[PDB]
Design an enzyme around this catalytic site. Structure first.
Site, short mmCIF file in Angstrom:
data_model
loop_
_atom_site.label_atom_id
_atom_site.label_comp_id
_atom_site.label_asym_id
_atom_site.label_seq_id
_atom_site.Cartn_x
_atom_site.Cartn_y
_atom_site.Cartn_z
CE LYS A 235 -14.07 1.90 -33.09
NZ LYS A 235 -14.53 1.56 -31.69
CG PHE B 135 -15.03 2.79 -22.30
CD1 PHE B 135 -14.68 3.77 -23.22
CD2 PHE B 135 -16.27 2.87 -21.68
CE1 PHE B 135 -15.55 4.81 -23.52
CE2 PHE B 135 -17.15 3.90 -21.98
CZ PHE B 135 -16.78 4.87 -22.90
NE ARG C 53 -27.95 6.90 -33.74
CZ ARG C 53 -28.62 8.04 -33.91
NH1 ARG C 53 -27.98 9.21 -33.90
NH2 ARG C 53 -29.94 8.01 -34.09
CB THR D 226 -20.89 -0.38 -28.98
OG1 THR D 226 -19.49 -0.11 -28.97
CG2 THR D 226 -21.36 -0.77 -27.59
NE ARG E 105 -19.57 -0.56 -33.82
CZ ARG E 105 -19.94 0.53 -33.16
NH1 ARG E 105 -21.16 0.62 -32.64
NH2 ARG E 105 -19.08 1.55 -33.03
CG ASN F 152 -16.59 -1.61 -31.71
OD1 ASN F 152 -15.60 -1.00 -32.13
ND2 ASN F 152 -17.52 -1.05 -30.96
CG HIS G 140 -16.11 6.34 -34.23
ND1 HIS G 140 -16.51 6.50 -32.92
CD2 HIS G 140 -16.34 7.53 -34.84
CE1 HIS G 140 -16.94 7.74 -32.74
NE2 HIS G 140 -16.86 8.38 -33.89
CD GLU H 186 -17.26 11.63 -33.56
OE1 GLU H 186 -17.61 11.00 -34.59
OE2 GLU H 186 -17.50 11.24 -32.42
#
Lengths: 141, 141, 141, 141
Positions: D10, D58, D86, D92, D106, D116, D119, D130
């Site tokens: 991100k 959100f 994951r 998160t 994270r 964070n 993804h 995705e």
């Protein structure tokens, strides 16, 4: 001045799991990554990318190696980037890089002359050609 | 000499369902299509594409229009392609195109000066820049 | 329902200069073009694209042909697009297409069973797979 | 079994110069990188990528953040990749990640709940959606 240059992480470095460390090096040296992608040169494309070397003896070997597996290209931007990136990667012979430039990318991740981990543009003229060869303006963000 | 130039079919021509006929015209005129793709300029990218016009009075309108919907770009290749393509598309005012170049793309598909169907590179310098802005060497096949 | 399907204009139709006319046909038929690009399958990618046919007798010929030159793919969207597009292109044997579906794309532009001008997704399942094989969500605009 | 999953680094992590270290982590964990690119979500594309969250509170903040700057996506392949990736990235909420999963991505590179760092696909179903959203089959090498 602020310049852009192209690097390509070669299949030997890719296979050694060096990609993250190599990008980190450039980040730590202060460069901004303006474009990035994994792809695979066909032999024909590798040959065009390296057209200036067509008549060199190493040409067929280079074209084959550079099309032998996936690579990762990045556009690096920063003050005096072309010269600095050239120096950061070191002499093209990895073993010589270990002898005369021990902290260079090729010293650290290169194996020999052919498997030498990384490519970087040599000059302002070649950086311009090489960047456009790999990335359109749409891909530079 | 054999040259490459860039065309972009604009949103007005897209919406008129002219895309096929426009590509067909360049094919009938004898050009090879070397790259082709549908994409959408962000306002920022349109502005960069048209940077030479940034201080012109029509700039914001142009940028907004060229980012208002999907467009299709193509690289055309042929003898004297840059000037021949300019002539095939006609005067930038579509109404004037109907008056002085009735067989031109803009006369046939264009509406006015803003909705004028199609863009083509203006010079060898702009062709070089515009082709690289939209397509990498990897996309030219 | 509104559906998406993939077409690919094959090297025979490309070489005949049929690209513009073929896109125009789908436009006149009322489809929206949602993605479009010219590219070249490597043999390996063609084989992956046609993996369902890997054990069929025509496989190697198909893979070689579909990697023998540039092709153009498009995503077409419209009511019942998947079956309507199949019908528009006609029987896979171009000569048979001339006999039973004279207005079909294959009748008009196809040569025989191998050089048959165009590919279209066969089913909803294959459409989903084929569209993703060629275009990302980022390329659909 | 061997699986593919998608990660996206991100804009917060990009800006902190974490990209190299983050990719390195996945390489050291034993994943193969099968696709990689830097790009920028438009707000519309970010919204489609995150469509399952449309009705969450959100949502607008996420869409804006994820389109506020360039990001880097990668396809990771390995044994049990979806579940393992994951777990590697962690909870998160980055501050909570520091409290309960100190070696997670994270915890290491995340700031808070919004910023964070990264993804990753949540499930086999979302991984499939995705991955195709970001990368075509042509881009997986």
């Amino acid at each position: 001045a602020v310049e852009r240059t192209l690097i390509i992480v070669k299949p030997d470095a890719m296979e050694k799991g060096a990609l993250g460390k190599i990008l980190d090096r450039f980040i730590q040296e202060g460069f901004q990554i303006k474009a990035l992608k994994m792809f695979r040169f066909t032999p024909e494309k590798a040959g065009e990318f390296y057209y200036v070397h067509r008549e060199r003896p190493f040409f067929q070997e280079l074209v084959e190696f550079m099309s032998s597996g996936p690579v990762v290209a990045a556009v690096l931007e920063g003050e005096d980037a072309i010269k600095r990136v050239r120096e950061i990667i070191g002499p093209t012979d990895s073993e010589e890089a270990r002898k005369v430039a021990p902290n260079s990318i090729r010293a650290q991740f290169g194996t020999d002359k052919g498997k030498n981990a990384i490519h970087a543009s040599d000059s302002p003229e070649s950086a311009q050609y090489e960047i456009c060869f790999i990335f359109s303006g749409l891909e530079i963000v």
